[PDB]
Structure formats: structure tokens, C-alpha cells
mmCIF file of C-alpha atoms and ligand atoms in Angstrom:
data_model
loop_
_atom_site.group_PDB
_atom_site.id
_atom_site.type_symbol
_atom_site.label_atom_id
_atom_site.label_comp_id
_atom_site.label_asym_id
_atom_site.label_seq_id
_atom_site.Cartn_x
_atom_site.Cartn_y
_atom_site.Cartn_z
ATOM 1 C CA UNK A 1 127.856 82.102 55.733
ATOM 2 C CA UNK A 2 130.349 83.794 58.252
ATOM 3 C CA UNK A 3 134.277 83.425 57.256
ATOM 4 C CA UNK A 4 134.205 82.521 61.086
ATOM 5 C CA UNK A 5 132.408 79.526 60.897
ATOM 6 C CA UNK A 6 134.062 76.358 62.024
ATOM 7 C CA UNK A 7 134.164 72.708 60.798
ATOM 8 C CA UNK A 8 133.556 69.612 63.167
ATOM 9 C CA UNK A 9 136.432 67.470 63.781
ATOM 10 C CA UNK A 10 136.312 63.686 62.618
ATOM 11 C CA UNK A 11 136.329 60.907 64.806
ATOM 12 C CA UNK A 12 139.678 59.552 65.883
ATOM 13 C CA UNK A 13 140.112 55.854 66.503
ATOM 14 C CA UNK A 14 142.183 55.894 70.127
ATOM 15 C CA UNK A 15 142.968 52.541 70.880
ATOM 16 C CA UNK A 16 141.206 49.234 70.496
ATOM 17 C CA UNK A 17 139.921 46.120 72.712
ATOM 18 C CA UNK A 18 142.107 43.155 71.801
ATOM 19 C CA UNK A 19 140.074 40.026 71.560
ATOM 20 C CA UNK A 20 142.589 38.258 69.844
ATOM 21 C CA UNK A 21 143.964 36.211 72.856
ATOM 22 C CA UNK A 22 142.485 34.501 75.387
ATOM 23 C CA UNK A 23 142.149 37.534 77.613
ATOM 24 C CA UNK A 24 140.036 40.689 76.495
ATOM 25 C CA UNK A 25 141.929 43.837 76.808
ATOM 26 C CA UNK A 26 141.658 47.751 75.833
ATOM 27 C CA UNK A 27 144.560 49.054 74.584
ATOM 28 C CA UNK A 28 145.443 52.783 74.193
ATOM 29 C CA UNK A 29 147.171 53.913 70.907
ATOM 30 C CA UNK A 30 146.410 57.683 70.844
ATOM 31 C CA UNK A 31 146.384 60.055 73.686
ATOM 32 C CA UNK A 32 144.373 62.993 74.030
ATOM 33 C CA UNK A 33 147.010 65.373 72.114
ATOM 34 C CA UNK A 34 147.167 63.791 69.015
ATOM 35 C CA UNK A 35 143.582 62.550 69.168
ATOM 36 C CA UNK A 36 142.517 66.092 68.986
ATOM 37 C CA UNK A 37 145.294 67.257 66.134
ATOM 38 C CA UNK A 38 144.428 64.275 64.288
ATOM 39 C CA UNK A 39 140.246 65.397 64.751
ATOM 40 C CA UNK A 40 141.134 68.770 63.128
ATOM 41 C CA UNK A 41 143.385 67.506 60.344
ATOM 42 C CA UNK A 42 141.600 64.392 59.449
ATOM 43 C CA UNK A 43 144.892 62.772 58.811
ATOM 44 C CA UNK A 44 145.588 59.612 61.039
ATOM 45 C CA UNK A 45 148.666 57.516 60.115
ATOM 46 C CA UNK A 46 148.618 54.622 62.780
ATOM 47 C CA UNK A 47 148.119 51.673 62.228
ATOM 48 C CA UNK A 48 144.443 49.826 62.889
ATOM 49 C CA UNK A 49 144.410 46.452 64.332
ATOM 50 C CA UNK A 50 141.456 44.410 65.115
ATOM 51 C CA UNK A 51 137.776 44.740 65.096
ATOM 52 C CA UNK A 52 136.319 46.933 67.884
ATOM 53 C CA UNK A 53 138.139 50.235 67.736
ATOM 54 C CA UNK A 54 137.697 52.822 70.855
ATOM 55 C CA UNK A 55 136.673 56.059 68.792
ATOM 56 C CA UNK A 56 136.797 59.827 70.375
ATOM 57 C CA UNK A 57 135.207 63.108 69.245
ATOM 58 C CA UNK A 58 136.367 66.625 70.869
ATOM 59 C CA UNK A 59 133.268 65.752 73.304
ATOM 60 C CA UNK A 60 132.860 61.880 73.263
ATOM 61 C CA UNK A 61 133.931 58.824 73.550
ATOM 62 C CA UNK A 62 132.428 55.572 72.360
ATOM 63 C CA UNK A 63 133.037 52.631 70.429
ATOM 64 C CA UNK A 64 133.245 51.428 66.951
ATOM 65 C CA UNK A 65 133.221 47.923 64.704
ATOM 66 C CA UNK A 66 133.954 46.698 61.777
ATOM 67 C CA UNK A 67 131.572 44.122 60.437
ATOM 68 C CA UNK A 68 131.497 42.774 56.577
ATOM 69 C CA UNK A 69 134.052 45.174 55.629
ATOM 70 C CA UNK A 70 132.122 48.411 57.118
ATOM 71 C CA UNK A 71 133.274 50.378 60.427
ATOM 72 C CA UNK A 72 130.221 51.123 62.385
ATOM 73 C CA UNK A 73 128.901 53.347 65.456
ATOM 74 C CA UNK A 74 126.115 55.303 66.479
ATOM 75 C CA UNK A 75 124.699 58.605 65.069
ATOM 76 C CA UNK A 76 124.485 60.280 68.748
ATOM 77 C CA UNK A 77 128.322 59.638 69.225
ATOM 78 C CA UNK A 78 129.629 60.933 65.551
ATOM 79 C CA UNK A 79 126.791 62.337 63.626
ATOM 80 C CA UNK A 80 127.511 62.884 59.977
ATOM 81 C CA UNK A 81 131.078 63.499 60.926
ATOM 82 C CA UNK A 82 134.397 62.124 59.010
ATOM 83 C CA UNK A 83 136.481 59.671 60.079
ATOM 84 C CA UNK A 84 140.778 60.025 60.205
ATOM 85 C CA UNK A 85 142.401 58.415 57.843
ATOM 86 C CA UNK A 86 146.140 58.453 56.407
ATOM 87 C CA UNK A 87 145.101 59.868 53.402
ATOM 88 C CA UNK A 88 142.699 62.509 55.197
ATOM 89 C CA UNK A 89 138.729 62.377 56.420
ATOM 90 C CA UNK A 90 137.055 59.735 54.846
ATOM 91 C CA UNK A 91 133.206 60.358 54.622
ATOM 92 C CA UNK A 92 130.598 57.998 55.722
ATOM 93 C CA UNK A 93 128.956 55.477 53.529
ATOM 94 C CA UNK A 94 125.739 54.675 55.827
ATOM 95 C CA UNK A 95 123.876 57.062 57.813
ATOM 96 C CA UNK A 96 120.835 56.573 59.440
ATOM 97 C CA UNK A 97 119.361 58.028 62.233
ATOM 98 C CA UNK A 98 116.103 56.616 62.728
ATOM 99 C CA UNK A 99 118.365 53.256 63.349
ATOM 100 C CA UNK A 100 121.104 55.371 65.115
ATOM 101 C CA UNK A 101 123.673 53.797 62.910
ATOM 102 C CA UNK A 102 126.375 55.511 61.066
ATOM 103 C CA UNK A 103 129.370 53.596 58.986
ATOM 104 C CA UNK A 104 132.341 54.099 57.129
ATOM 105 C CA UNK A 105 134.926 51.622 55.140
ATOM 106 C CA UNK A 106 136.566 49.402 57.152
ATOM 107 C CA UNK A 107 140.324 50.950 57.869
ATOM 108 C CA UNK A 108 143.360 49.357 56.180
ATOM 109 C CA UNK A 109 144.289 47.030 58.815
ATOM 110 C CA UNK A 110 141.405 45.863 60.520
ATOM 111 C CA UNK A 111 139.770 42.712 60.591
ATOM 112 C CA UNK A 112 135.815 41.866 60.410
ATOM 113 C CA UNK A 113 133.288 40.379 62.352
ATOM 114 C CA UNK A 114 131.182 37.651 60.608
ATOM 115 C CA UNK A 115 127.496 38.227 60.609
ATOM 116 C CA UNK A 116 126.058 36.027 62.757
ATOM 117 C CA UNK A 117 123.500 33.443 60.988
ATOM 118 C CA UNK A 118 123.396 31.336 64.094
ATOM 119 C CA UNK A 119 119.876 32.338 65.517
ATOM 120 C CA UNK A 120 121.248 31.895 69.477
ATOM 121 C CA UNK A 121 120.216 33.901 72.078
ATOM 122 C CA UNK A 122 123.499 33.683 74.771
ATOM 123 C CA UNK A 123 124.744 37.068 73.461
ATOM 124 C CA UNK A 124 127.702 38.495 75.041
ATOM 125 C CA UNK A 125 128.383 42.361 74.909
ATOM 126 C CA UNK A 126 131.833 43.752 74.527
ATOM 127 C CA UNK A 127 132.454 46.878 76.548
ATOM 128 C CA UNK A 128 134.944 49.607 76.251
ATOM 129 C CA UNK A 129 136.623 48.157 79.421
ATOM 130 C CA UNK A 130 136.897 45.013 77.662
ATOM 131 C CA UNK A 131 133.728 43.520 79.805
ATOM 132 C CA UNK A 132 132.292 40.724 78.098
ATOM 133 C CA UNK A 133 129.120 40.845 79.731
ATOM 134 C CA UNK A 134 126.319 37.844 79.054
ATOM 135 C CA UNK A 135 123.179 39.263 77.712
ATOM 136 C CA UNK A 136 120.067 37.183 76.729
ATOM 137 C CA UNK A 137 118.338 38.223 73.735
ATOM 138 C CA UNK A 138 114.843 38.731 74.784
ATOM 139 C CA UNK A 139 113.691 40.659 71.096
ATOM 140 C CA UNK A 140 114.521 41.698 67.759
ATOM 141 C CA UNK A 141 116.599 44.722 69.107
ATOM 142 C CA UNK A 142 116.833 44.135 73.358
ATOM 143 C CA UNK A 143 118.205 42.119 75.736
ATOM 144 C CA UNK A 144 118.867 41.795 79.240
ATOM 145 C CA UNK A 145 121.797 41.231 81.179
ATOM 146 C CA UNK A 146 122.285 38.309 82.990
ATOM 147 C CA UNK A 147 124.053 40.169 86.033
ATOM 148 C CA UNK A 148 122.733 43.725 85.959
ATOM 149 C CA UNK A 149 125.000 46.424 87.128
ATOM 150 C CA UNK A 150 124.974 50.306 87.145
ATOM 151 C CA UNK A 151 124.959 52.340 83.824
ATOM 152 C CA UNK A 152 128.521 53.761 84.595
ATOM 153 C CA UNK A 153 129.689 50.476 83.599
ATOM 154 C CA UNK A 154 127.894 50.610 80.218
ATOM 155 C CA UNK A 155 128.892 54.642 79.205
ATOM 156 C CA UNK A 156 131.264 54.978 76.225
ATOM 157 C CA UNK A 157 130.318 51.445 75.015
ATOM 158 C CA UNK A 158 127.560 52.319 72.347
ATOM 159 C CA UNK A 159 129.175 50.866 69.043
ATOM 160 C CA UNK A 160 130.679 47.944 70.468
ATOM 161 C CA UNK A 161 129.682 44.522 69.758
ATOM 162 C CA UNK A 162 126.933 41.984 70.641
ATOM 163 C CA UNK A 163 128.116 38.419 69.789
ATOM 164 C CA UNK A 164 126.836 34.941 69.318
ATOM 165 C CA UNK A 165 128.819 31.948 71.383
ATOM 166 C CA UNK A 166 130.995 31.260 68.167
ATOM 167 C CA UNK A 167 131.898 35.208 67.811
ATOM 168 C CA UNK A 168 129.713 36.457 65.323
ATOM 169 C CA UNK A 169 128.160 39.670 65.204
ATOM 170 C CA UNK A 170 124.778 39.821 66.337
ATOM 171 C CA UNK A 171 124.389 43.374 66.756
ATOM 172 C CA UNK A 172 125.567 46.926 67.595
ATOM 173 C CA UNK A 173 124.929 48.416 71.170
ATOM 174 C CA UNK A 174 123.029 51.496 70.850
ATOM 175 C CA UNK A 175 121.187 52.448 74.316
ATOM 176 C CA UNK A 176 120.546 50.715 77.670
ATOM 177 C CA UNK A 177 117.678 50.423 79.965
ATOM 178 C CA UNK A 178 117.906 51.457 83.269
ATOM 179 C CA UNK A 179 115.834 51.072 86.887
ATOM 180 C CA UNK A 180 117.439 53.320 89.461
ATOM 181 C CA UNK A 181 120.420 53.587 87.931
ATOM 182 C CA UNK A 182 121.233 50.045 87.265
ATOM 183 C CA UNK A 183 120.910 48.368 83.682
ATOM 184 C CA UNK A 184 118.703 45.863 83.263
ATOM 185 C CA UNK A 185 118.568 45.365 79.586
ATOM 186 C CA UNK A 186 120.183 46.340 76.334
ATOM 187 C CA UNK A 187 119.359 47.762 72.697
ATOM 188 C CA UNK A 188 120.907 47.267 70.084
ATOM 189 C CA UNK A 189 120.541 47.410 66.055
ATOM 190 C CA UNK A 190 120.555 43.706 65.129
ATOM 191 C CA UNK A 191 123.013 42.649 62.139
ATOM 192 C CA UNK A 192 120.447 41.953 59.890
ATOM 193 C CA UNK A 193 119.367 45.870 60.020
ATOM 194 C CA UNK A 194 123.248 46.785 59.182
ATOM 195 C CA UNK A 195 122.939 44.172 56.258
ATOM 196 C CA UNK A 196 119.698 46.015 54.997
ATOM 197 C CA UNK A 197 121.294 49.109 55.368
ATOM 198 C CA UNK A 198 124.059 47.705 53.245
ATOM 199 C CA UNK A 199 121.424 47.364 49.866
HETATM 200 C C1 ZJY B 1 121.130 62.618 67.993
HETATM 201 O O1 ZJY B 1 120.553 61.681 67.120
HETATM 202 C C2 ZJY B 1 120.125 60.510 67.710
HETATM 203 C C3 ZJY B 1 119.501 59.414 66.843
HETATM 204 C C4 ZJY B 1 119.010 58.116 67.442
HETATM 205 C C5 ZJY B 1 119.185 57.932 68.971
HETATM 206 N N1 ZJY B 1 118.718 56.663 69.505
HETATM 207 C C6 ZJY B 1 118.878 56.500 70.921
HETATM 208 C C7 ZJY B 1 118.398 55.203 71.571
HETATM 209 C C8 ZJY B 1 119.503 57.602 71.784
HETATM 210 O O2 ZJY B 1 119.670 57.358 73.133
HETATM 211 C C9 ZJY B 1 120.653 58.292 73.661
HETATM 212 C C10 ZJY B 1 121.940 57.963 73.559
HETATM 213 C C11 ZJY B 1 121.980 56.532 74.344
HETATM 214 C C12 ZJY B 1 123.153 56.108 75.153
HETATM 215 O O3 ZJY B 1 123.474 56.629 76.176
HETATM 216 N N2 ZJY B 1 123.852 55.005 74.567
HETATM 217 C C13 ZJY B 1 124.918 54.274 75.254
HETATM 218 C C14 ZJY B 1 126.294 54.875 75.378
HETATM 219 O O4 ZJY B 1 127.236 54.360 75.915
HETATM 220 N N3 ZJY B 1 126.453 56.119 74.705
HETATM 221 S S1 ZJY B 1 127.945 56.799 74.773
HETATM 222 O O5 ZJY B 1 129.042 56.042 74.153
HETATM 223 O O6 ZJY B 1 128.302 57.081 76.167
HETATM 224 C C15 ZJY B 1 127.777 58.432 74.020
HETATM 225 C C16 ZJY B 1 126.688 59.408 74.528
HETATM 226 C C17 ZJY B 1 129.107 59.008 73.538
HETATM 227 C C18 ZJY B 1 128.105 58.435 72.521
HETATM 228 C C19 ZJY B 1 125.032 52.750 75.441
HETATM 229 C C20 ZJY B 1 124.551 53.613 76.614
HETATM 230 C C21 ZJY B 1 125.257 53.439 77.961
HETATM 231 C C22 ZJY B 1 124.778 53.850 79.157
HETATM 232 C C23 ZJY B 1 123.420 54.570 79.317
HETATM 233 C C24 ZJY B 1 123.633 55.984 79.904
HETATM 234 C C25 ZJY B 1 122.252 56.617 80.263
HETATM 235 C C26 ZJY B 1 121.430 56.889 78.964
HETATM 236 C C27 ZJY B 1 120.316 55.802 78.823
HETATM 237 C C28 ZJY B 1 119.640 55.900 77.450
HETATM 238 N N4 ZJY B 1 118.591 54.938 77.429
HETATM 239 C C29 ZJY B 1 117.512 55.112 76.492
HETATM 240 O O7 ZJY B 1 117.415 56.075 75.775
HETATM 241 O O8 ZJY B 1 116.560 54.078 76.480
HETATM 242 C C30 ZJY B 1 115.621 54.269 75.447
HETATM 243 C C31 ZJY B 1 115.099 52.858 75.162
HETATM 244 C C32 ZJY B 1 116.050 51.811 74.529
HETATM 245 F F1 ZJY B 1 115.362 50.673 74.296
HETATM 246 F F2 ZJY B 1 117.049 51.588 75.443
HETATM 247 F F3 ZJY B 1 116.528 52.321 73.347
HETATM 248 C C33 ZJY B 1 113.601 52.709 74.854
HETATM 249 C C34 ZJY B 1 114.147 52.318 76.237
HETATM 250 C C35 ZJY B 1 120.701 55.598 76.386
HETATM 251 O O9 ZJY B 1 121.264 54.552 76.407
HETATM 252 N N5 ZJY B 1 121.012 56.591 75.360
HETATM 253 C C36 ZJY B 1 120.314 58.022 75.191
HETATM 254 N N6 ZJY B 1 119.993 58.848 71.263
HETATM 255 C C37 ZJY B 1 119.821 59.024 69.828
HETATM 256 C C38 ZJY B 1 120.304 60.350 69.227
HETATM 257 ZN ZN1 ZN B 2 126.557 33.113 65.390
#
């Protein structure tokens, strides 16, 4: 309406947790300078590596993975916004909120996740710390972890990975459960819901 009124930022991919060894560790590639140039101009010309990217808004921080060619998150980290790309703000080709699910295309450079087709229940849940934390699926969309700890530990993790024993994709954290502080149990949005999504 107003020639004052502002445009949100897209998300910036700021580093990455490197599973591709036999050690899991996050890696930084952006720091908080360029991640927030790179938010207003929508242009982001590193490189992407990997499948579990460590995302950033002006006000969050969270996680983000690719799966079957799609980069996905959750709607309360990025909303409807764009993603950075080299060529400018790429906008998103799923967006759901009643699933909490947002995704884009996959960047140039990344690598998938496999859906998992497995139907195990030793999940293990890939944290922004590069935790992999053992979770047993107890539902459709929960489970609980096998050595509970406090929700600190979880923040900034929502749109990282739950995976099966051979490293597929099971699902996509989205919001933990918590007594007193301390997280009991997991939700998540189970693959098959991203590959419903998809059609
Ligand atoms: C606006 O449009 C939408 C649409 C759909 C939607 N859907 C949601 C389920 C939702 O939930 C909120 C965000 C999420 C969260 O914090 N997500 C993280 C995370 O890390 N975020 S993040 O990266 O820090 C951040 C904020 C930058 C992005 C993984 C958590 C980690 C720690 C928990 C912190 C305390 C919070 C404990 C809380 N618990 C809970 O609500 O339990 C409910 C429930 C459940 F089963 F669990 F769903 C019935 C029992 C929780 O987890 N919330 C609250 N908001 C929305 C909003
Ligand atoms: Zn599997």
C-alpha cells in the first residue's frame, strides 16, 4: 500500500552437518554478515554440499533437508519466504501449514536422502549440533527419545532429519514434547506425508 513497506528476507543456508564421514559434524559456511546481505538480496553464490543444510532467517535459525530432490523445513521457521540462490530467491514449491512443512528445489550441489521404505522403528534424529540422538518411533508422527535431555538441546533443529538404521529418511522434525523442561518425545512429519505432498 505504503511506498514504505518492506519485503521479508529469504532464508540463507549457513553451513551444513557433514554426515559424510564417519564422524557427524556442523560446519559453518556463512557468517552472520553475509547471511543477512545475502537474506535481502536473495542472491547466494556458495556452494551447497550435502543433505541437511543449517538455514537462518533475520530472526531464526533452524534446519533444512533435501529429500527426493526437494529442500525441506518447517512453516514456523520460514513461512512462505524465498530461499537464496545464485541466480536470486527461488520461491517455494510446497507449502503447507496444517503439516508445518514448507519446500523448495533441491540446490545445485546437494545430495538427497532416500525415502525410507524400511518400516523400522530405531530412528535416529540429526540435530543442528550434529547429535544423532536414538529415537523410537512410538506413532505415525512421534517418538520418544531413548535418553531424554532438556529442550535446549533440541532448539534450532526443526527441519533436520529422522532416519532409519540404513540412512533413509523417515521424517522431518517439527516440534518436541516436553515434561519440566526435558524432552521426552518427538514429532515429526513422516516421509510418506512429504511424498503426498509431492502429488
Ligand atoms: C506459524 O505457523 C505454524 C504452523 C504449524 C506449527 N506446528 C507446530 C507443532 C508448532 O510448534 C511450534 C514451533 C515448535 C518448535 O519449537 N519446533 C522445534 C524447533 O527447534 N524449532 S526452531 O528451529 O527452534 C524455530 C522456532 C526456529 C524455527 C523442534 C523444537 C525444539 C525444541 C522445543 C522448544 C520448546 C517448544 C515446544 C513445542 N512443542 C509443541 O508445540 O508440542 C505440541 C505437540 C507436538 F506433538 F509436539 F507437536 C502436541 C504436543 C515445539 O516444539 N514447537 C512450537 N508451530 C507451528 C506454527
Ligand atoms: Zn529405511
Amino acid at each position: 500500500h505504503m511506498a514504505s513497506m518492506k519485503k521479508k528476507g529469504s532464508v540463507v543456508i549457513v553451513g551444513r552437518i557433514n554426515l559424510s564421514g564417519d564422524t557427524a559434524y556442523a560446519q559453518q559456511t556463512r557468517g552472520e554478515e553475509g547471511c543477512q546481505e545475502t537474506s535481502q538480496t536473495g542472491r547466494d553464490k556458495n556452494q551447497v554440499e550435502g543433505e541437511v543444510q543449517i538455514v537462518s532467517t533475520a530472526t531464526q535459525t533452524f534446519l533444512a533437508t533435501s529429500i527426493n530432490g526437494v529442500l525441506w523445513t518447517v512453516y514456523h521457521g520460514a513461512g512462505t519466504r524465498t530461499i537464496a540462490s545464485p541466480k536470486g530467491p527461488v520461491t517455494q514449491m510446497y507449502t503447507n501449514v496444517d503439516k508445518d512443512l514448507v519446500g523448495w528445489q533441491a540446490p545445485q550441489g546437494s545430495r538427497s536422502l532416500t525415502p525410507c521404505t524400511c518400516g523400522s522403528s530405531d530412528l535416529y534424529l540429526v540435530t543442528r549440533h550434529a547429535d544423532v540422538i536414538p529415537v523410537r518411533r512410538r506413532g505415525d508422527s512421534r517418538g520418544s527419545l531413548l535418553s531424554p535431555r532438556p529442550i535446549s538441546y533440541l532448539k534450532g533443529s526443526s527441519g533436520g532429519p529422522l532416519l532409519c538404521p540404513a540412512g533413509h529418511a523417515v521424517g522431518i522434525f517439527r516440534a518436541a514434547v516436553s515434561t519440566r523442561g526435558v524432552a521426552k518425545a518427538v514429532a515429526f512429519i513422516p516421509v510418506e506425508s512429504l511424498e503426498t505432498t509431492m502429488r
